[PDB]
Every structure is written in structure tokens, then in C-alpha cells.
CSV table of C-alpha atoms in Angstrom, one decimal:
chain,number,residue,atom,x,y,z
A,225,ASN,CA,87.7,-62.3,112.2
A,226,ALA,CA,85.6,-60.3,109.7
A,227,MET,CA,82.3,-61.9,110.7
A,228,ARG,CA,79.3,-60.5,112.4
A,229,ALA,CA,76.7,-62.1,114.7
A,230,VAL,CA,73.1,-60.9,114.7
A,231,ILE,CA,70.5,-61.9,117.4
A,232,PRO,CA,66.8,-61.6,116.6
A,233,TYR,CA,65.1,-60.4,119.9
A,234,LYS,CA,61.9,-59.0,121.3
A,235,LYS,CA,61.5,-58.6,125.0
A,236,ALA,CA,57.8,-57.6,125.2
A,237,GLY,CA,55.4,-60.4,125.6
A,238,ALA,CA,58.3,-63.0,125.2
A,239,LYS,CA,57.9,-66.7,125.7
A,240,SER,CA,54.1,-67.0,126.0
A,241,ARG,CA,54.4,-70.8,126.0
A,242,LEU,CA,56.0,-70.3,129.4
A,243,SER,CA,53.0,-68.6,130.8
A,244,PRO,CA,51.7,-71.7,132.7
A,245,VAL,CA,54.8,-71.4,135.1
A,246,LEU,CA,56.1,-67.8,134.7
A,247,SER,CA,54.5,-64.4,135.0
A,248,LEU,CA,54.8,-61.9,132.3
A,249,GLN,CA,57.3,-60.0,134.4
A,250,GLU,CA,59.2,-63.2,135.1
A,251,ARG,CA,59.3,-64.1,131.4
A,252,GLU,CA,60.7,-60.9,130.2
A,253,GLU,CA,63.3,-60.9,132.9
A,254,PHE,CA,64.2,-64.5,132.0
A,255,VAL,CA,64.6,-63.7,128.3
A,256,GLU,CA,66.7,-60.6,129.2
A,257,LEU,CA,69.0,-62.9,131.2
A,258,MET,CA,69.3,-65.3,128.3
A,259,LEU,CA,70.1,-62.5,125.9
A,260,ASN,CA,72.9,-61.2,128.1
A,261,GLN,CA,74.2,-64.7,128.2
A,262,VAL,CA,74.3,-65.4,124.5
A,263,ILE,CA,75.9,-61.9,123.9
A,264,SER,CA,78.5,-62.7,126.6
A,265,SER,CA,79.3,-66.1,125.0
A,266,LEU,CA,79.6,-64.5,121.6
A,267,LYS,CA,82.3,-62.1,122.9
A,268,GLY,CA,84.0,-64.9,124.7
A,269,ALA,CA,84.5,-66.8,121.4
A,270,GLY,CA,86.2,-63.5,120.2
A,271,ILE,CA,83.3,-62.2,118.2
A,272,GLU,CA,83.2,-58.5,118.8
A,273,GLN,CA,80.8,-57.2,116.2
A,274,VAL,CA,77.4,-58.3,117.8
A,275,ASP,CA,74.1,-56.9,116.6
A,276,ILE,CA,70.7,-57.2,118.1
A,277,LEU,CA,67.8,-57.1,115.8
A,278,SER,CA,64.6,-56.0,117.6
A,279,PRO,CA,61.3,-54.4,116.5
A,280,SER,CA,61.6,-51.9,119.5
A,281,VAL,CA,64.0,-50.5,121.9
A,282,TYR,CA,62.2,-51.9,124.8
A,283,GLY,CA,64.5,-53.6,127.3
A,284,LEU,CA,67.3,-52.3,125.0
A,285,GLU,CA,67.6,-48.6,126.1
A,286,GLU,CA,70.8,-49.1,128.1
A,287,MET,CA,72.4,-51.8,126.0
A,288,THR,CA,76.0,-51.3,125.2
A,289,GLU,CA,77.3,-54.8,124.8
A,290,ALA,CA,76.0,-55.0,121.2
A,291,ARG,CA,74.5,-52.7,118.6
A,292,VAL,CA,70.8,-52.4,118.9
A,293,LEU,CA,69.1,-52.5,115.4
A,294,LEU,CA,65.5,-51.5,115.0
A,295,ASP,CA,63.3,-53.1,112.4
A,296,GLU,CA,59.6,-53.5,112.8
A,297,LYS,CA,59.1,-55.9,109.9
A,298,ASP,CA,58.6,-59.6,110.6
A,299,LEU,CA,61.6,-61.8,111.3
A,300,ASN,CA,62.3,-63.2,107.8
A,301,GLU,CA,61.9,-59.7,106.2
A,302,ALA,CA,64.2,-58.1,108.8
A,303,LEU,CA,66.9,-60.9,108.5
A,304,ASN,CA,66.9,-61.0,104.7
A,305,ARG,CA,67.3,-57.2,104.6
A,306,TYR,CA,70.3,-57.6,107.1
A,307,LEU,CA,71.8,-60.5,105.0
A,308,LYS,CA,71.5,-58.3,101.9
A,309,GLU,CA,73.5,-55.4,103.5
A,310,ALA,CA,76.0,-57.9,105.1
A,311,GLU,CA,79.5,-57.8,103.7
A,312,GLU,CA,81.4,-60.4,105.8
A,313,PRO,CA,80.1,-63.8,107.1
A,314,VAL,CA,77.0,-63.7,109.4
A,315,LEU,CA,76.1,-65.9,112.4
A,316,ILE,CA,72.4,-65.6,113.0
A,317,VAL,CA,71.9,-66.8,116.6
A,318,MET,CA,68.7,-67.1,118.7
A,319,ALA,CA,68.6,-65.4,122.1
A,320,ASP,CA,67.1,-68.5,123.9
A,321,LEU,CA,70.0,-70.9,123.9
A,322,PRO,CA,71.4,-70.7,127.4
A,323,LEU,CA,73.4,-74.0,127.0
A,324,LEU,CA,75.4,-72.6,124.0
A,325,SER,CA,79.1,-72.1,124.9
A,326,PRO,CA,82.0,-70.1,123.4
A,327,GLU,CA,83.3,-73.5,122.2
A,328,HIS,CA,80.2,-74.3,120.3
A,329,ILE,CA,80.2,-70.8,118.7
A,330,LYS,CA,83.9,-71.3,117.6
A,331,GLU,CA,83.2,-74.6,115.9
A,332,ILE,CA,80.0,-73.4,114.2
A,333,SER,CA,81.7,-70.3,112.7
A,334,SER,CA,84.9,-72.4,111.8
A,335,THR,CA,83.0,-74.5,109.3
A,336,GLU,CA,84.6,-75.3,106.1
A,337,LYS,CA,81.3,-75.3,104.3
A,338,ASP,CA,79.3,-72.2,103.1
A,339,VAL,CA,76.7,-72.9,105.8
A,340,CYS,CA,76.7,-74.4,109.2
A,341,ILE,CA,73.3,-75.2,110.6
A,342,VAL,CA,72.4,-76.0,114.2
A,343,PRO,CA,68.9,-77.6,114.6
A,344,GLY,CA,66.5,-76.8,117.4
A,345,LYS,CA,63.7,-78.8,118.9
A,346,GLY,CA,60.7,-79.5,116.6
A,347,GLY,CA,62.5,-78.7,113.3
A,348,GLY,CA,63.6,-75.2,114.2
A,349,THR,CA,67.0,-73.5,113.5
A,350,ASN,CA,68.9,-72.3,116.6
A,351,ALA,CA,72.0,-71.1,114.9
A,352,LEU,CA,72.9,-70.3,111.2
A,353,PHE,CA,76.5,-69.6,110.1
A,354,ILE,CA,76.4,-68.1,106.6
A,355,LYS,CA,79.6,-67.3,104.7
A,356,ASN,CA,77.9,-65.7,101.7
A,357,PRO,CA,75.1,-63.5,103.0
A,358,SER,CA,74.5,-62.1,99.4
A,359,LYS,CA,73.8,-65.7,98.2
A,360,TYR,CA,71.5,-66.8,101.0
A,361,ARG,CA,68.0,-66.4,102.2
A,362,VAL,CA,66.4,-67.6,105.4
A,363,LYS,CA,62.9,-68.6,106.4
A,364,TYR,CA,62.4,-69.0,110.1
A,365,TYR,CA,59.3,-70.5,111.6
A,366,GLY,CA,57.7,-73.8,110.8
A,367,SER,CA,60.0,-76.4,109.3
A,368,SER,CA,63.0,-74.2,109.1
A,369,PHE,CA,65.9,-76.5,109.7
A,370,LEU,CA,65.0,-78.6,106.6
A,371,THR,CA,64.0,-75.5,104.6
A,372,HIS,CA,67.4,-73.9,105.4
A,373,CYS,CA,69.1,-77.1,104.2
A,374,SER,CA,67.3,-77.0,100.9
A,375,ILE,CA,67.8,-73.2,100.5
A,376,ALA,CA,71.5,-73.9,101.0
A,377,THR,CA,71.6,-76.4,98.2
A,378,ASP,CA,68.9,-74.9,95.8
A,379,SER,CA,71.4,-71.9,95.9
A,380,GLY,CA,74.7,-73.9,95.1
A,381,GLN,CA,76.0,-73.7,98.7
A,382,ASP,CA,77.1,-76.8,100.7
A,383,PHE,CA,76.3,-77.1,104.3
A,384,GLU,CA,77.3,-78.8,107.7
A,385,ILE,CA,74.8,-80.0,110.4
A,386,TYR,CA,76.4,-79.1,113.7
A,387,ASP,CA,75.4,-82.0,116.0
A,388,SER,CA,75.0,-80.5,119.5
A,389,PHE,CA,72.6,-81.4,122.3
A,390,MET,CA,73.4,-78.2,124.3
A,391,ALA,CA,73.2,-75.9,121.2
A,392,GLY,CA,70.1,-77.7,120.2
A,393,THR,CA,68.4,-76.8,123.5
A,394,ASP,CA,66.3,-73.8,122.8
A,395,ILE,CA,64.1,-72.7,125.7
A,396,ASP,CA,60.5,-72.4,124.7
A,397,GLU,CA,58.2,-74.4,127.0
A,398,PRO,CA,58.1,-75.3,130.7
A,399,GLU,CA,59.7,-78.8,130.0
A,400,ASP,CA,62.7,-77.1,128.4
A,401,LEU,CA,63.4,-75.5,131.9
A,402,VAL,CA,64.1,-79.0,133.2
A,403,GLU,CA,66.9,-79.2,130.6
A,404,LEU,CA,68.2,-75.8,131.7
A,405,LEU,CA,68.2,-76.9,135.4
A,406,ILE,CA,70.0,-80.1,134.7
A,407,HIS,CA,72.6,-78.8,132.3
A,408,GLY,CA,73.1,-75.0,132.7
A,409,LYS,CA,75.2,-72.5,134.6
A,410,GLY,CA,74.8,-68.8,134.7
A,411,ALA,CA,72.3,-66.2,135.8
A,412,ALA,CA,69.5,-67.7,133.5
A,413,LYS,CA,69.9,-71.0,135.2
A,414,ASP,CA,70.1,-69.4,138.7
A,415,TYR,CA,67.0,-67.3,138.0
A,416,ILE,CA,65.0,-70.5,137.2
A,417,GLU,CA,66.6,-72.4,140.1
A,418,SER,CA,65.4,-69.6,142.5
A,419,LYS,CA,61.8,-70.6,141.5
A,420,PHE,CA,61.6,-74.3,140.7
A,421,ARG,CA,63.0,-77.6,141.7
A,422,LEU,CA,63.3,-81.0,139.8
A,423,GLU,CA,61.3,-83.9,141.3
A,424,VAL,CA,61.2,-87.5,140.3
A,425,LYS,CA,57.8,-88.9,139.9
A,426,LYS,CA,57.2,-91.1,137.0
A,427,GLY,CA,60.6,-92.8,137.0
A,428,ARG,CA,60.7,-89.3,135.4
A,429,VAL,CA,62.0,-85.8,136.1
A,430,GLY,CA,59.5,-82.9,136.3
A,431,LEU,CA,59.6,-79.2,137.1
A,432,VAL,CA,57.9,-78.1,140.3
A,433,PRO,CA,57.5,-74.6,141.7
A,434,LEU,CA,59.6,-73.9,144.8
B,71,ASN,CA,91.3,-102.6,122.7
B,72,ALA,CA,88.4,-105.1,123.5
B,73,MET,CA,85.0,-104.3,125.0
B,74,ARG,CA,81.4,-105.5,125.4
B,75,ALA,CA,78.2,-103.7,124.6
B,76,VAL,CA,74.8,-104.3,126.2
B,77,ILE,CA,71.3,-103.1,125.2
B,78,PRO,CA,68.5,-103.3,127.8
B,79,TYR,CA,65.4,-104.3,125.9
B,80,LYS,CA,61.8,-105.6,126.5
B,81,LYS,CA,59.5,-105.7,123.5
B,82,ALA,CA,56.3,-106.3,125.6
B,83,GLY,CA,54.3,-103.2,126.4
B,84,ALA,CA,57.5,-101.4,125.4
B,85,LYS,CA,56.8,-97.6,125.1
B,86,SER,CA,53.5,-96.8,126.9
B,87,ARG,CA,53.9,-93.0,126.6
B,88,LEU,CA,53.4,-93.5,122.8
B,89,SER,CA,49.8,-94.5,123.5
B,90,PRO,CA,47.5,-93.2,122.3
B,91,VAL,CA,49.2,-92.0,119.2
B,92,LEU,CA,50.3,-95.6,118.6
B,93,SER,CA,48.7,-98.9,119.5
B,94,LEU,CA,50.1,-101.7,121.5
B,95,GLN,CA,50.8,-103.6,118.3
B,96,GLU,CA,52.4,-100.5,116.8
B,97,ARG,CA,54.6,-99.8,119.8
B,98,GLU,CA,56.0,-103.3,119.9
B,99,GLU,CA,56.8,-103.2,116.1
B,100,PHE,CA,58.4,-99.8,116.2
B,101,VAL,CA,60.6,-100.7,119.2
B,102,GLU,CA,61.8,-103.9,117.4
B,103,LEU,CA,62.8,-101.7,114.3
B,104,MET,CA,64.7,-99.3,116.7
B,105,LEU,CA,66.5,-102.2,118.3
B,106,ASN,CA,67.7,-103.5,115.0
B,107,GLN,CA,69.0,-100.2,113.9
B,108,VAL,CA,71.0,-99.8,117.3
B,109,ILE,CA,72.6,-103.3,116.9
B,110,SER,CA,73.4,-102.4,113.3
B,111,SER,CA,75.2,-99.2,114.5
B,112,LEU,CA,77.2,-101.1,117.1
B,113,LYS,CA,78.3,-103.6,114.4
B,114,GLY,CA,79.0,-100.7,112.0
B,115,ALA,CA,81.4,-99.5,114.7
B,116,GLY,CA,83.2,-102.8,114.6
B,117,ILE,CA,82.2,-103.9,118.0
B,118,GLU,CA,82.7,-107.6,118.1
B,119,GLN,CA,79.8,-108.7,120.3
B,120,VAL,CA,76.6,-107.1,121.4
B,121,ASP,CA,74.5,-108.5,124.2
B,122,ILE,CA,70.8,-107.8,124.5
B,123,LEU,CA,69.6,-107.9,128.1
B,124,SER,CA,65.9,-108.8,128.1
B,125,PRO,CA,63.6,-110.4,130.8
B,126,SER,CA,62.2,-112.8,128.2
B,127,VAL,CA,62.9,-114.3,124.8
B,128,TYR,CA,59.8,-112.6,123.4
B,129,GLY,CA,60.8,-110.7,120.2
B,130,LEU,CA,64.2,-112.2,120.3
B,131,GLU,CA,63.2,-115.8,119.4
B,132,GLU,CA,65.2,-115.4,116.1
B,133,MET,CA,68.2,-113.2,116.7
B,134,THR,CA,71.6,-113.8,115.5
B,135,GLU,CA,73.0,-110.3,115.3
B,136,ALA,CA,73.5,-110.2,119.0
B,137,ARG,CA,73.7,-112.6,121.9
B,138,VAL,CA,70.5,-112.7,123.9
B,139,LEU,CA,71.0,-112.7,127.6
B,140,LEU,CA,68.0,-113.2,129.8
B,141,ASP,CA,67.6,-111.6,133.2
B,142,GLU,CA,64.2,-111.2,134.7
B,143,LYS,CA,65.5,-108.6,137.4
B,144,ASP,CA,64.8,-104.8,137.4
B,145,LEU,CA,66.9,-102.8,134.9
B,146,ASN,CA,69.5,-101.6,137.3
B,147,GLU,CA,69.9,-104.9,139.0
B,148,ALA,CA,70.4,-106.7,135.8
B,149,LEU,CA,72.8,-104.1,134.5
B,150,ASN,CA,74.7,-104.0,137.7
B,151,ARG,CA,75.1,-107.8,137.6
B,152,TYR,CA,76.4,-107.6,134.0
B,153,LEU,CA,78.8,-104.9,135.0
B,154,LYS,CA,80.2,-107.1,137.9
B,155,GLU,CA,80.9,-110.0,135.5
B,156,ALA,CA,82.6,-107.8,132.9
B,157,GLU,CA,86.4,-107.2,133.2
B,158,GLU,CA,86.8,-105.0,130.2
B,159,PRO,CA,85.1,-101.7,129.2
B,160,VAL,CA,81.2,-101.8,128.9
B,161,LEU,CA,79.1,-99.5,126.6
B,162,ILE,CA,75.5,-99.6,127.8
B,163,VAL,CA,73.3,-98.3,125.0
B,164,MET,CA,69.5,-97.8,125.0
B,165,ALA,CA,67.4,-99.5,122.3
B,166,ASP,CA,65.5,-96.3,121.4
B,167,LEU,CA,68.2,-94.3,119.7
B,168,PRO,CA,67.5,-94.4,116.0
B,169,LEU,CA,69.7,-91.3,115.2
B,170,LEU,CA,72.8,-92.9,116.7
B,171,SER,CA,75.4,-93.5,114.1
B,172,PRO,CA,78.5,-95.7,114.1
B,173,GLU,CA,80.5,-92.5,114.1
B,174,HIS,CA,78.8,-91.5,117.5
B,175,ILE,CA,79.5,-95.0,118.9
B,176,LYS,CA,83.3,-94.8,117.7
B,177,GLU,CA,83.6,-91.4,119.4
B,178,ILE,CA,81.9,-92.4,122.6
B,179,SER,CA,84.0,-95.5,123.2
B,180,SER,CA,87.3,-93.5,122.3
B,181,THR,CA,86.8,-91.2,125.2
B,182,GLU,CA,89.9,-90.2,126.9
B,183,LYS,CA,88.0,-90.1,130.2
B,184,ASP,CA,87.1,-92.9,132.6
B,185,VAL,CA,83.4,-92.7,131.7
B,186,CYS,CA,81.6,-91.2,128.7
B,187,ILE,CA,78.1,-90.2,129.1
B,188,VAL,CA,75.3,-89.3,126.6
B,189,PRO,CA,72.3,-87.3,128.1
B,190,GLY,CA,68.9,-88.0,126.9
B,191,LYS,CA,66.0,-85.7,127.4
B,192,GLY,CA,64.6,-84.8,130.9
B,193,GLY,CA,68.0,-85.8,132.6
B,194,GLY,CA,67.9,-89.5,131.3
B,195,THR,CA,71.1,-91.4,130.2
B,196,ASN,CA,71.1,-92.7,126.6
B,197,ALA,CA,74.6,-94.3,126.4
B,198,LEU,CA,77.2,-95.0,129.1
B,199,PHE,CA,80.8,-96.0,128.4
B,200,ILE,CA,82.5,-97.3,131.5
B,201,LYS,CA,86.3,-98.2,131.2
B,202,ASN,CA,86.4,-99.6,134.8
B,203,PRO,CA,83.3,-101.6,135.5
B,204,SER,CA,84.6,-102.8,138.9
B,205,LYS,CA,84.5,-99.1,140.1
B,206,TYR,CA,81.1,-98.1,138.6
B,207,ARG,CA,77.5,-98.6,139.6
B,208,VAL,CA,74.5,-97.6,137.4
B,209,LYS,CA,71.2,-96.1,138.3
B,210,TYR,CA,68.9,-95.5,135.3
B,211,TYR,CA,65.4,-93.9,135.8
B,212,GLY,CA,64.7,-90.5,137.4
B,213,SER,CA,67.5,-88.1,137.3
B,214,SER,CA,70.1,-90.6,135.9
B,215,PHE,CA,72.3,-88.3,133.9
B,216,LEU,CA,73.3,-86.2,137.1
B,217,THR,CA,73.4,-89.4,139.2
B,218,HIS,CA,76.0,-91.1,136.8
B,219,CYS,CA,78.2,-88.1,136.6
B,220,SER,CA,78.2,-88.0,140.5
B,221,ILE,CA,78.6,-91.8,140.8
B,222,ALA,CA,81.7,-91.2,138.6
B,223,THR,CA,83.2,-88.4,140.7
B,224,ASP,CA,82.4,-89.9,144.2
B,225,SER,CA,84.5,-92.9,142.7
B,226,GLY,CA,87.6,-91.0,141.6
B,227,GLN,CA,86.8,-91.3,138.0
B,228,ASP,CA,86.6,-88.5,135.5
B,229,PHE,CA,83.8,-88.3,132.8
B,230,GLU,CA,83.2,-86.9,129.4
B,231,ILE,CA,79.7,-85.5,128.5
B,232,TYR,CA,79.2,-86.5,124.9
B,233,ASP,CA,77.3,-83.5,123.4
B,234,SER,CA,75.3,-84.8,120.4
B,235,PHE,CA,71.8,-83.9,119.4
B,236,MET,CA,71.4,-87.2,117.4
B,237,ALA,CA,72.6,-89.6,120.2
B,238,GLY,CA,70.6,-87.6,122.7
B,239,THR,CA,67.2,-88.0,120.9
B,240,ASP,CA,65.6,-91.0,122.5
B,241,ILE,CA,62.2,-91.7,121.2
B,242,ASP,CA,59.8,-91.9,124.0
B,243,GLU,CA,56.8,-89.7,123.4
B,244,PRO,CA,54.8,-88.4,120.3
B,245,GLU,CA,56.8,-85.2,120.1
B,246,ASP,CA,60.0,-87.4,119.7
B,247,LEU,CA,58.6,-88.9,116.4
B,248,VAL,CA,58.7,-85.3,115.0
B,249,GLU,CA,62.5,-85.5,115.5
B,250,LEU,CA,62.7,-88.9,113.9
B,251,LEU,CA,60.8,-87.7,110.9
B,252,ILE,CA,62.9,-84.6,110.5
B,253,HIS,CA,66.4,-86.1,111.2
B,254,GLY,CA,66.3,-89.8,110.7
B,255,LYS,CA,66.8,-92.4,108.0
B,256,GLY,CA,65.9,-96.0,107.9
B,257,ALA,CA,63.3,-98.5,108.8
B,258,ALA,CA,62.1,-97.0,112.1
B,259,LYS,CA,61.6,-93.6,110.4
B,260,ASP,CA,59.9,-95.2,107.3
B,261,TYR,CA,57.5,-97.0,109.7
B,262,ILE,CA,56.4,-93.7,111.3
B,263,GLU,CA,56.5,-91.9,107.9
B,264,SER,CA,54.0,-94.5,106.7
B,265,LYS,CA,51.5,-93.5,109.3
B,266,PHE,CA,52.1,-89.7,109.9
B,267,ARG,CA,53.2,-86.5,108.2
B,268,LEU,CA,54.5,-83.2,109.6
B,269,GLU,CA,52.2,-80.3,109.5
B,270,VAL,CA,52.9,-76.6,110.3
B,271,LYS,CA,50.3,-74.8,112.5
B,272,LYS,CA,51.4,-72.1,114.9
B,273,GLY,CA,54.4,-71.5,113.0
B,274,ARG,CA,55.2,-74.9,114.5
B,275,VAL,CA,55.7,-78.5,113.3
B,276,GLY,CA,53.2,-81.1,114.5
B,277,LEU,CA,52.7,-84.8,113.9
B,278,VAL,CA,49.4,-85.6,112.2
B,279,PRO,CA,48.1,-89.0,111.0
B,280,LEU,CA,47.7,-89.8,107.2
């Protein structure tokens, strides 16, 4: 495996859409827990070259599991620079996917197309396997899943949609913490489970502080 | 090799959490389009007959694609009666799965386990394949996904979790119509596309009326 993974990450001020339920301190710990999980899953699928791409060393000073990479530019700028310098296929993976497994990561990066794309909630992109980093450009934010699919083509690459519920579950708002509680394992899940419980009220399942 | 498939369906007042982005009249029309697409996927997967289990004929007055079975009892009571009278495997599929493909239904009903289960959001159950109906009891609503796995294990039977983003997108609230616009094809999607567009605002996708 000549293939690298890079994880965009910023610990400071993380997950402000969780601020109705989680403190600032809670939110940054939670995001640290998720990062450590995605890194540990990437290793477990036998990917040993793991990069973190961050605009500061904050919460990354003692990190040894993956190379910390500093880059203060915005996401798309930073990732396109990285893709430029890449010389072996690249898996761009978000840090907020605590339901993502070694198995998912294997099947994604075993695509037979040039690009494998995992969608997130709301038209985002949770995971991007790119075989030709010199041929590809990315554009996160907004309607990125579809914009990555037409960047793939517009650039003479073919692409796979990886159809996964678990991989598709990015944690961004309080309601996504119900998914985590129902479906996850690990310190990220345990952390959330130490502060909330699930309760049925509307014939429906809701999060409630413990 | 044989098997029955049932779709719990009630056109009237169908999808109240879609109000107020949709009307009564719109809700009932939408739901009917979604039903039709599910029955077409079941047929596309070669399943010989499909039952629709509905508390009235309303919206089913003309209906030749599937046998209409009437049962005025509560969902679980009706489904649990249907299960008792089946001998062969039963796929229970919700009528609100417009991203569900014949390929998903082929794979679900080919499970090598005793039950296959497809999660929907907030711990719901979007599709349930039960090989031994005599040994299974359903309980939709609330936390039904976790309940059906534990109904399975309490009963000796092993279960597969079918991990699919598309079969796991049930369309129940406004934010779900975003997913339909991004990922879907077909009449239910065209219906919505005729009334809304996607718009990007906080670096995020939102549904806005035309």
C-alpha cells in the first residue's frame, strides 16, 4: 500500500452546532476523541501513512499516531496544495465519522475507479479516495458531494458512490448524537453516553441530558 | 426460494412532520408517489407478490401492482397478525424509501442471517427481512432498530445490519427532502424538485421554495 490518508482537523472552537448541548470544553474533548478514533481505524485497515492537516498545533502537541501538518489557509486551499504534492493515492477523511470502520476504509480505498466518494448528511463529502491527486481538485463546503462527482467527470475520471449509512454519519448537530448512541462503540460513544440518554417521546427517539 | 413482501401504508394525513413545508394535499400526493416507487423496486427485484397493508382503501381504490390488504388495527398489531399467517420469509418495507433500489432489495433478502435489518434515522427500522416469521415479533416506533436486533437475539436468531445510506434515508421531515433532491431519481424527486431548490448559505445546503 502506497497510499496516504489525510485528515482535515481543527480542535479550537470545534462543532459550534453542538453548543446547545455541549460546552466548549466538552466539544473540543469530544472532537479529540473522534480524531483518535478515525486515526486508529485508519491504522487498523493497514494504512500507516496518516497525516493530519490543521491550521494550528493546538490539541496536536503530543500527537505521534500521525504526522501533524500545519497550514493556516482555508480547507480547499490547504487540501489542493496537499493533493498537488501527493505522489501516491490519497484518502481525504473527515475527523467526525465515529461509525466509520476499518472495513469501510478498506472497501473505499479498494475501488476500481479513479475516485470513490462517500456522501455525508446535507450533501457533504465524508470521505474521498483519489487515485490521481495530480488530476483532481476538491471543493468542500456547500454542495460538495455533487460538486466532487462533477469535478471527477469534468476531469476525465470515473467515480464510485460508496453507499454506507455508518460512513455517511458525520457528527455535526445534537440530533447526530442520537445516531452515535444507537450505533457506535468506542471512547467517543462512551463520552456522549456518560452525558445523555435516549428517550422515546414522540413515537420518536430524542437526546436528553443525564 | 419464495417469500412475501408487505408495505404498511396510510395515505390520509400521511406525513405530518412535513407540515408546514408541505400542505395536506401535497403530503398525500408525495406519499403516493413514494409508495409507487417502492412497489416498483420490489417488482424490479422479482418478488412475485407485494401486499400493501392499509387501514382503508383510500388512495388504493385503483391498484393492481400489489394486493391491497386492509387492517384497521395499529401498525404493530396488523404486522404481527400478517407475520403469524405467513409461513415463508417476510420482507417488511416502509413506503417512504424513494432511494431504495432493486439491488438493495436483492441484497437484503439474500442475507445469510436469520434476519436482515435496515436502520432508518433516529433508531427507526426501514426494512426488515425475517426468514422465520413464527419466531419473530415486530415493534416499530420508538427505538425500533435496537428493539428488533434484541427481539432477534432473545429468540436465538442471528441478524445482519444492512449498511446502506440510500435504503436508510426515509423521508419524514423537511431536511430529508434535501437528501431526496441530492441523491434521488424519479417521480417523488421530480415532485419536490418542482416546488423547491437547494441553496447554499452557511457553507450549508438548505431547501428553499421556488
